[PDB]
Amino acid sequence: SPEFDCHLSDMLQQLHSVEAEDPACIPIFWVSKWVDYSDKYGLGYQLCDNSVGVLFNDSTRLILYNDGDSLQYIERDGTESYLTVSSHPNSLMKKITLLKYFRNYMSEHLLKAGANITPDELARLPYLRTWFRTRSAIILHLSNGSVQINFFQDHTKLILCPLMAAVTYIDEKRDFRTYRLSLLEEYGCCKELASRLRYARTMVDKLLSS
């Protein structure tokens, strides 16, 4: 279905037109940690529920649930299969090994982004659809429609949700604020948020046009 990307294009349209805070719009899922081993292996990530995923170079995906045992494997054509750490096909040994290596690295060394974001609506576990980097940021596109942008220089982050029509901004002080895009469109926002939303427009355009 091209509905998600159309919602994303609709959000892009809204961003072009952009007391606007609304806690009812707080995201349920975002990327809290990531490791870029894309030269040889792929991109590993942690979601805020402590689940870990990898988008491998061969365009396959392996997802470990936060129970630390359950695994979903998604083949290139979209075929989904389920397995566990203890019960798995031999062909998946290397990919499982790599996921556990990434999991250990992130757990040992890395900060959990949005650890202070306060947690009714059904939470459906997404996977990483695609990602790319610029000099200034990493852009992460989740299967639920959400687009996350992490800025390297000041550690500020944006979480863009097309379904909720909302944006969450994590500032340098690690304080989070969630805004309704319609309220930003109608009333405007600070230059701090405005400048990052301008860059986000370019990034989302890049994502959609590819």
Binding site: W34, V35, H109, L110, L111, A113, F152, H155
Partner: peptide
């Protein structure tokens, strides 16, 4: 960087 904030 090759990883998120340490």
């Amino acid at each position: 960087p090759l990883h998120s904030t340490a």
